From a paper:
Each complex structure was comprised of one copy of the RBD-hACE2 molecule in one asymmetric unit.
In the Mink-Y453F RBD-hACE2 structure, the carbonyl group of hACE2 D30 forms a hydrogen bond with Nδ1 in hACE2 H34, leading to the Cδ2 from H34 forming a hydrophobic interaction with the phenyl group of RBD F453. Thus, when compared with the hydrophilic hydroxyphenyl group of WT RBD Y453, the phenyl group at this residue (F453) shifts toward hACE2 H34 by 0.4 Å. Moreover, the number of hydrogen bonds in the Mink-Y453F RBD-hACE2 increased, by one, when compared to WT RBD-hACE2. Alpha RBD, Beta RBD, Gamma RBD, Mink-Y453F RBD, and Mink-N501T RBD displayed higher affinities to hACE2 than WT RBD, with ~7, ~3, ~5, ~8, and ~4-fold increase in binding strength, respectively.
Numbering used by the authors:
A (entry chain A): 19 to 614
B (entry chain B): 333 to 527
The structure:
Amino acid sequence: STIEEQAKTFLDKFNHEAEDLFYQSSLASWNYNTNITEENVQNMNNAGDKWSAFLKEQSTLAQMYPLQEIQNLTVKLQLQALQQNGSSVLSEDKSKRLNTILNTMSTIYSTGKVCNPDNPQECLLLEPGLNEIMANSLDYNERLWAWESWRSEVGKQLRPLYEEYVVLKNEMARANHYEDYGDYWRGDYEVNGVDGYDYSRGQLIEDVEHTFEEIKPLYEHLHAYVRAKLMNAYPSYISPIGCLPAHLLGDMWGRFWTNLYSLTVPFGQKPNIDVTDAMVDQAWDAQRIFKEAEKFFVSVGLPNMTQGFWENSMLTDPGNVQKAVCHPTAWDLGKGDFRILMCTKVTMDDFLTAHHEMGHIQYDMAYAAQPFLLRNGANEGFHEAVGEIMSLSAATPKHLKSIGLLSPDFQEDNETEINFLLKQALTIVGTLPFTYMLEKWRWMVFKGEIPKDQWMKKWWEMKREIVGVVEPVPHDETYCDPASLFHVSNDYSFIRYYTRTLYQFQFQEALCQAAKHEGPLHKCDISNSTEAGQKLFNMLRLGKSEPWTLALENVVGAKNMNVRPLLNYFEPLFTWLKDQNKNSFVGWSTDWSPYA
Amino acid sequence: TNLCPFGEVFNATRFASVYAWNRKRISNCVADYSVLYNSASFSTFKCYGVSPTKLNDLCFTNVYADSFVIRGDEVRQIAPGQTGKIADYNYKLPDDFTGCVIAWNSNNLDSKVGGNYNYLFRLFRKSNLKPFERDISTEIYQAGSTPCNGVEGFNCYFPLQSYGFQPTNGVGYQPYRVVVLSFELLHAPATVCGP
Ligand SMILES: *[C@@H]1O[C@H](CO)[C@@H](O)[C@H](O)[C@H]1NC(C)=O
Ligand SMILES: *[C@@H]1O[C@H](CO)[C@@H](O)[C@H](O)[C@H]1NC(C)=O
Ligand SMILES: *[C@@H]1O[C@H](CO)[C@@H](O)[C@H](O)[C@H]1NC(C)=O
Ligand SMILES: *[C@@H]1O[C@H](CO)[C@@H](O)[C@H](O)[C@H]1NC(C)=O
Ligand SMILES: [Zn+2]
């Protein structure tokens, strides 16, 4: 028997162990997340530990079969995914040092607390204490205190650990034959051995930077409009030509500008479409919310939810003393077991989230027939992109009217649509420069292009130049401000939010063309379009078995990330923004800072 | 008026693993086949050659009842000219099969919280099974060229794999009990008529 045929038999055994052992771990994880007890944490760890040990074992055995002697690509993809050393390429001491560093940074982030001056007992955590300030406070000094104290007392702890984390991660990555840890992260987009569909790791940098150049005019005009609105509210704090102070952006980092809506709403006289009252007036419950989402997917030709979904999911808060993690999550346990965990309330937001989460379930069910290792999104940005476009269609006035929630006597006017596109842009557009500047800073740190004695100097130079945000307090190299964000201190790659955002509008534009939608893209609803569900399903069922370039082409007809659908979505706002900024300065000086 | 012992087959407490499928020979009795086909309690009732509709007006020399448990997605494989793990390695029906295949969901019986691992299936074999062949061997499968020495290791796998049957599995992974009725016609006394 050849090496390939040995590999197929080895993967045959792995898949069958892996269903059951992953299923037991998922089932133990489910019981804890729905019923928080000390016994459930133990069982979750025991089941999780055996799965981790099995994966370890199986990775070592997979390394027996040389990839160079395998021709079948779908076999080679499965072995390569299982073969990856990860941290197990370092010596045993160094992997233990790295794991200790990762746990300490995670613990510092989740337990870091700030106490106000003159009361060492009234202390706040990031969640919910400091997050509440950064999302709801209008007071300049209260926001400044939360922004600075989080970075000065928690971020400074992370600075020595993050330096050692950079050294050890680069050591694993170069031992795995990558240039550096950032090059390792970019491997999630790499495709080899498929004529017409290949994609190199370095190509991702070029495509991200090329598409970001076309985003700049829209972001600059968003930035100028936001600065002008905030300058009216804080005349003595904001320069007409300067960067936006980093602590006046709606959250702890300025990751999203969502909470600036109240101070920047163009027409604050026209109320939002809030369909919550209609839901309560009609005595909707959580099951009704999820049946309505189910009918939405059935309307485009997708299957209904399984019987096990209705019996096994937790769609409401358990309540009295059985206590649960209420973060909305879609679960793929394997063996045809699909569930949603969600403490659903009767609100418009939860109604949209249900469509979002069930979009994940539809993606999971579509590739359930794939081999175990290929049951995932095409790349790291595909799965969330599928979820986002479901809430795009479900939120439109056209869709809310068709389901009896929005009054037929409500007609769209251009002022409410500028209001809606602004708030979309504050969240969706505003995060793109933030997401790009951060991942490039990490990419440059990993590549060796930023010395340690210039980490924060270069971090805030790129904030001013690329994001147009300026720190309100000078920060020396004892700070580790990037690590003050969850994804940085918890060792998660971040470019996935940039790519996903471009993907979702590529998906929506393609599906809406298949649905033969007329008018602006942001008013589209793909409901009742089997042609649109079919073209979506042709990618969903692929899972991870095909290159993400080909999976993208199935939906949109193009092989690469494209920014034009994103700009097409926001063009009505872009035109309105340019007219608003005609007597305003567009762009920012990087030298101005609030501390002069 | 001796009634054929079908309840012993269909209503058995425990079914056999498909790799070691039971066969019970049925002889010298009266079979009311119409009761089974007109009971509305099976999810699959498909007959090949013979017709389920009131062909308990026929006499057969012997009747064989083969029973086992497989998952729901593998029930297609119990049919002539099918391929797959069950059809190739565990239970194989001939191309000219004359008989009926009966299956029903048994999640309430063969599933258990934490997993029921009582039922096995053969995952590896050197070759495919002949029709109505049974292999209960536990020889370690030699995937490579190095002998296994009777223990599992690199390229050496135990040939049987267990179903993990949990009540929360999807329908395709839930256990299904299967009964295969074979109607043999020999140049012979034809002892099973069953009005
Ligand atoms: C919660 O877990 C405990 C054991 O940790 C168990 O005895 C109890 O039945 C569970 N409750 C629910 C509602 O699942
Ligand atoms: C790869 O192997 C699978 C199963 O072993 C087979 O179905 C598929 O056709 C093979 N692909 C190629 C290109 O040989
Ligand atoms: C889903 O639809 C099928 C028809 O294709 C139907 O047989 C089944 O009962 C439905 N299940 C649910 C939970 O609606
Ligand atoms: C199995 O038991 C049920 C209930 O006792 C009965 O109706 C059915 O006929 C039995 N099966 C057979 C094959 O007799
Ligand atoms: Zn999501």
